[PDB]
Amino acid sequence: HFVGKYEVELKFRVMDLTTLHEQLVAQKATAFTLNNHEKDIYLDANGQDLAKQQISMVLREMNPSGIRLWIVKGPGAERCEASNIEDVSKVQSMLATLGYHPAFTIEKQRSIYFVGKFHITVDHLTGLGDFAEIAIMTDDATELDKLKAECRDFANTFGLQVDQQEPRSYRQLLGF
Amino acid sequence: HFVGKYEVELKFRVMDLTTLHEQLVAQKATAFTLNNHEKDIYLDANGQDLAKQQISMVLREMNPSGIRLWIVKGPGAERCEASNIEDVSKVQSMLATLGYHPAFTIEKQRSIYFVGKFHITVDHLTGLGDFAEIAIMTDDATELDKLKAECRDFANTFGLQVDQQEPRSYRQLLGF
Ligand SMILES: Nc1ncnc2c1ncn2[C@@H]1O[C@@H]2COP(=O)(O)O[C@H]2[C@H]1O
Ligand SMILES: Nc1ncnc2c1ncn2[C@@H]1O[C@@H]2COP(=O)(O)O[C@H]2[C@H]1O
Ligand SMILES: [Mn+2]
Ligand SMILES: [Mn+2]
Ligand SMILES: [Mn+2]
């Protein structure tokens, strides 16, 4: 479910969580991980070198699931790779040696469900409210066309509507 | 054994592999890895930004132990940190996004033994020959001189003498 260098996705504001849960049930979604607090530390160079290239780099800690991820997103909104790491402070030290330092933090509550090849991620952020994203990862850039159309078809059958679309990232929404 | 951000290390050309091995037995060394093939991919920015800071960055694969490491050495002498990684190609792709690309590769056969607080590495490099590294990692900068002198004593005890000390790195010896 998380294999590749590209994450094809469509994100929406969710206005009613009960209806979302019903939409999930209707699609026979299965739970991957539920109700994790994710703390994302974003790193960048002193002169915001990565952000100036549309790149974000995150050390993510997920609790209680215990997962820790090193994530590089971009350039732009499709490219996304992650590596499991065992020791966040060790990787953060190593990145600091290379000149990347904590820039800001984004926290959220996240649940991830699966329906066939798709993953559905349901997020809550304090100022901002609830979001749901339909996504699929691929290693093959030639496919991004097919897959984005497929995401749209699934979003449509699921019940997630264009009026509620939210194209911006959390760092864009929060002003980072 | 591999805890810290400093590594104190002395490397020697090995003139007498038999004595070295005989002493590993005498001193009841424990084998951590034996006769592994190690392939080290060195990475740097196009402008050699890391070398200009006396930083080296390596992705190492050791077989058959299946250990994979991301290693950042430097800046300058005695600084070294490493992280276990699941997948070299994944980390390599992530670092390429940040601007670090393969510069050259070094291969060697390496065995790693522990004796008390020390580790001793016995290396063979096709063009170059046989070497041994005597090393210890620490987080404490206040003991580095003592540790280095202890490494030299310990090395003499395996038949490794000051006149066979080799200050150049493998990258230097191989013209990289
Ligand atoms: N264990 C995991 N849990 C959640 N996402 C993961 C995991 N492993 C890899 N990923 C992927 O890494 C990506 C990092 O950015 P996203 O949160 O947008 O989406 C994430 C997933 O596609
Ligand atoms: N699991 C491990 N196996 C081997 N070396 C390790 C491990 N974890 C950390 N290291 C250190 O990473 C260093 C990388 O550079 P060296 O080969 O000189 O010495 C290595 C060890 O001191
Ligand atoms: Mn996503
Ligand atoms: Mn995802
Ligand atoms: Mn070592």
Can you describe this structure?
Two copies of one chain form a homodimer. The first copy, chain A, has 176 residues and is an alpha+beta fold. Chain A has one domain: Hypothetical Protein Pfu-838710-001, CATH 2.40.320. Chain A has four helices and eight strands. In chain A, a hairpin with a 3-residue loop joins strand 7 (118-125) and strand 8 (129-138). The longest helix of chain A is centred in the C-terminal third of the chain and has 15 residues, at 144-158. The radius of gyration of chain A is 16 Å and the shape is globular. Chain A starts with 5 loop residues before the first strand and ends with a helix. Chain A binds chain B through residues 5, 50, 55, 57, 70, 72, 74-75, 79, 81, 83-87, 90-91, 93-94, 97-98, and chain B through 5, 50, 55, 57, 70, 72, 74-75, 79, 81, 83-87, 90-91, 93-94, 97-98. The structure holds adenosine-3',5'-cyclic-monophosphate (CMP) (2 copies) and manganese (II) ion (3 copies). Chains A, B: Its EC number is 4.6.1.1. Chains A, B: The modification Cysteine sulfenic acid (-SOH) is found at residue 80.
